[PDB]
Design an enzyme around this catalytic site. Structure first.
Site, PDB file in Angstrom:
ATOM      1  N   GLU A   1       8.407  -6.597   5.873  1.00  0.00           N
ATOM      2  CA  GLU A   1       9.165  -5.742   4.987  1.00  0.00           C
ATOM      3  C   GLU A   1      10.641  -5.999   5.249  1.00  0.00           C
ATOM      4  O   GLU A   1      11.045  -6.196   6.397  1.00  0.00           O
ATOM      5  CB  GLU A   1       8.845  -4.259   5.173  1.00  0.00           C
ATOM      6  CG  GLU A   1       9.735  -3.377   4.305  1.00  0.00           C
ATOM      7  CD  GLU A   1       9.144  -2.009   4.035  1.00  0.00           C
ATOM      8  OE1 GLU A   1       8.064  -1.704   4.582  1.00  0.00           O
ATOM      9  OE2 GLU A   1       9.761  -1.240   3.268  1.00  0.00           O
TER      10      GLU A   1
ATOM     11  N   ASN B   1      14.872  -4.961  -1.552  1.00  0.00           N
ATOM     12  CA  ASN B   1      13.704  -4.401  -0.874  1.00  0.00           C
ATOM     13  C   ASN B   1      12.475  -5.224  -1.245  1.00  0.00           C
ATOM     14  O   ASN B   1      12.272  -5.551  -2.416  1.00  0.00           O
ATOM     15  CB  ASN B   1      13.550  -2.929  -1.279  1.00  0.00           C
ATOM     16  CG  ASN B   1      12.590  -2.111  -0.400  1.00  0.00           C
ATOM     17  OD1 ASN B   1      12.155  -1.049  -0.842  1.00  0.00           O
ATOM     18  ND2 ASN B   1      12.258  -2.573   0.829  1.00  0.00           N
TER      19      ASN B   1
ATOM     20  N   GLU C   1       0.764   6.726   3.929  1.00  0.00           N
ATOM     21  CA  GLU C   1       1.281   5.376   4.170  1.00  0.00           C
ATOM     22  C   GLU C   1       1.509   5.222   5.669  1.00  0.00           C
ATOM     23  O   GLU C   1       2.155   6.072   6.277  1.00  0.00           O
ATOM     24  CB  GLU C   1       2.596   5.169   3.388  1.00  0.00           C
ATOM     25  CG  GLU C   1       3.170   3.754   3.459  1.00  0.00           C
ATOM     26  CD  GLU C   1       4.474   3.621   2.675  1.00  0.00           C
ATOM     27  OE1 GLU C   1       5.281   4.563   2.747  1.00  0.00           O
ATOM     28  OE2 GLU C   1       4.693   2.592   2.012  1.00  0.00           O
TER      29      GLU C   1
ATOM     30  N   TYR D   1       2.186   2.664   9.332  1.00  0.00           N
ATOM     31  CA  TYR D   1       2.823   1.497   9.926  1.00  0.00           C
ATOM     32  C   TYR D   1       2.489   1.435  11.408  1.00  0.00           C
ATOM     33  O   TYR D   1       2.668   2.430  12.122  1.00  0.00           O
ATOM     34  CB  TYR D   1       4.355   1.563   9.819  1.00  0.00           C
ATOM     35  CG  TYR D   1       4.979   1.460   8.444  1.00  0.00           C
ATOM     36  CD1 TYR D   1       5.055   2.560   7.598  1.00  0.00           C
ATOM     37  CD2 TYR D   1       5.557   0.274   8.031  1.00  0.00           C
ATOM     38  CE1 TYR D   1       5.658   2.465   6.365  1.00  0.00           C
ATOM     39  CE2 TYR D   1       6.160   0.160   6.814  1.00  0.00           C
ATOM     40  CZ  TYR D   1       6.195   1.257   5.974  1.00  0.00           C
ATOM     41  OH  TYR D   1       6.810   1.120   4.747  1.00  0.00           O
TER      42      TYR D   1
ATOM     43  N   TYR E   1       0.327  -2.619   8.120  1.00  0.00           N
ATOM     44  CA  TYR E   1       0.789  -1.690   7.094  1.00  0.00           C
ATOM     45  C   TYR E   1      -0.374  -1.362   6.161  1.00  0.00           C
ATOM     46  O   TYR E   1      -1.183  -2.239   5.843  1.00  0.00           O
ATOM     47  CB  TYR E   1       1.962  -2.323   6.314  1.00  0.00           C
ATOM     48  CG  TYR E   1       2.371  -1.607   5.057  1.00  0.00           C
ATOM     49  CD1 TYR E   1       2.996  -0.370   5.116  1.00  0.00           C
ATOM     50  CD2 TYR E   1       2.133  -2.160   3.811  1.00  0.00           C
ATOM     51  CE1 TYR E   1       3.353   0.304   3.954  1.00  0.00           C
ATOM     52  CE2 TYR E   1       2.500  -1.497   2.657  1.00  0.00           C
ATOM     53  CZ  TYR E   1       3.106  -0.272   2.739  1.00  0.00           C
ATOM     54  OH  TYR E   1       3.467   0.399   1.583  1.00  0.00           O
TER      55      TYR E   1
END
Length: 189
Positions: free
Chosen positions: A176, A43, A85, A87, A76
């Site tokens: 990401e 990740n 958070e 996106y 982001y």
């Protein structure tokens, strides 16, 4: 070639994070440029933009994005108070990150319809520590690797639907990846 962390490069904020698994190379270029090359990664998140962001920024991005597996290309960022958070997803690979989420509307901006979703993250890492917080998503129907994002159209559409934002923290264009391979080269302005 840099090691995870945050800072300023050629007038832009950057952030590069990875889970330690290896297989990711992130490089800061001149101005608003950054590159990411990854092979059987873990990740990771990396990009350039602003600290703090704003609620009416027009973000431009230009380059190439070639995922092989699970990856996203997004505007982001985070807000504080409330902790959010968010996106604005312009492109992605094998996994649509809105899968299984609750659809909360549609907004038209910058040449495409986007779908709006809300998810919840429970006791996950955040900019203020382990927390429970919502995620807001705009997912572009017509994928692309260059363009202009008028953030205010998304933030206002979210607010109409009850998805409110607080004080802006960082706001980047980010690649990401989750256990995948790819290459990207993106210039922000």
């Amino acid at each position: 070639t840099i090691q995870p962390g945050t800072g300023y490069n050629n007038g832009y904020f950057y952030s590069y994070w990875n889970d330690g698994h290896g297989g990711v190379t992130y490089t800061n270029g001149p101005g608003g440029q950054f590159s990411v090359n990854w092979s059987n990664s873990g990740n990771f998140v990396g990009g350039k933009g602003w600290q703090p962001g704003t609620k009416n920024k027009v973000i431009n991005f230009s380059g190439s994005y070639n995922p092989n597996g699970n990856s996203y290309l997004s505007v982001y960022g985070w807000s504080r108070n409330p902790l959010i958070e968010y996106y604005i997803v312009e492109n992605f690979g094998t996994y649509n990150p809105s899968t299984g989420a609750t659809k909360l509307g549609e907004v038209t901006s910058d040449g495409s319809v986007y779908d709006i979703y809300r998810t919840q993250r429970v006791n996950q890492p955040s900019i203020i520590g382990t927390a429970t917080f919502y995620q807001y998503w705009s997912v572009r129907r017509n994928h692309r690797s260059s363009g202009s994002v008028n953030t205010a159209n998304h933030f206002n559409a979210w607010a109409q639907q009850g998805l409110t934002l607080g004080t802006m923290d960082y706001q980047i264009v980010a690649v990401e990846g989750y256990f995948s391979s790819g290459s990207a080269s993106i210039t922000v302005s």
